[PDB]
Amino acid sequence: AEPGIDKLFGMVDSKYRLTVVVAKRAQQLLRHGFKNTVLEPEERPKMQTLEGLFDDPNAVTWAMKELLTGRLVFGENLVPEDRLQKEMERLYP
């Protein structure tokens, strides 16, 4: 099973809301090149390569780990979509 899947299901009122949050956060991480992550350097997902350990390229894996931390805020009608993207682009060029 996915790590912490039981905790993830308990954090939302509908299991399909969990998928929407994770999939949207995965797109945000990909769009900004993982520079907007809420994960500390000791917490970043890693993959084992022949050269050595590198950052995990799977943004769905990152979003699940981030959402377990509790530093992400999700909901409906939080901020305007245009205003949200413009601020996030400014913070993370």
Binding site: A1, E2, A23, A26, Q27, M47, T49, P57, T61
Partner: protein, 263 residues
Amino acid sequence: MVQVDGGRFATSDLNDLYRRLINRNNRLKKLLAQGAPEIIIRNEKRMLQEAVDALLDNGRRGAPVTNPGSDRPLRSLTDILSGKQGRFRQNLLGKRVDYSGRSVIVVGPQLKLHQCGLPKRMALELFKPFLLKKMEEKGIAPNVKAARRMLERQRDIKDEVWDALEEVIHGKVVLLNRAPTLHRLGIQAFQPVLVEGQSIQLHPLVCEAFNADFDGDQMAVHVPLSSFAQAEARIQMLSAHNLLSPASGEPLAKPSRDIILGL
């Protein structure tokens, strides 16, 4: 009206139905212009009505219209949209898809519940666009088109392609499907494990849900592409998450024949 590779022409049956209607319509115009008797005009009008009927719905009224030299009825507009082979059930409610494979299944007892054994050569073809990007990122190929030429010939594939493919599939999942898909557990998402060989390795605990034995069954492989498609498969459709039966609520991934016997 397409020309096949051999130079022969292939056409649909609607062209014959349209041609008859036009031939009869033009002939009626000529007969009307010549002041033909009513019997001739009436017969021509009756044929014109029947030509419209055949084009719209062939075989509904009277003898079906067949192409001369054969007894196969011509396919009309109504036949195109109706039936099990019509537009709705064959092309709208179900489709053939890209990024899909198929092979024989064998049992993988060493796998985890969320894992499957995907052959390397199926995985190379299924994840080809992702692989070409990864090959370009590393020094394997200068660009994507050069990378694609490398994979065309089997003897030109180097040993670093398999390392890149291992990197491509990390974290991703694929959908395994066995027909008939009687219930929703006939499609399940698994984390692929690249294996040497040509057969898909299936976990023993999911055989009951798939209704699969190992006397020659085959399964289909599908690759969800976007983050939404991956997130849905990894969260909702993963095998390790669907352990109870939706019909009754009882366990559906549970110890089976040999496992019960040993315990």
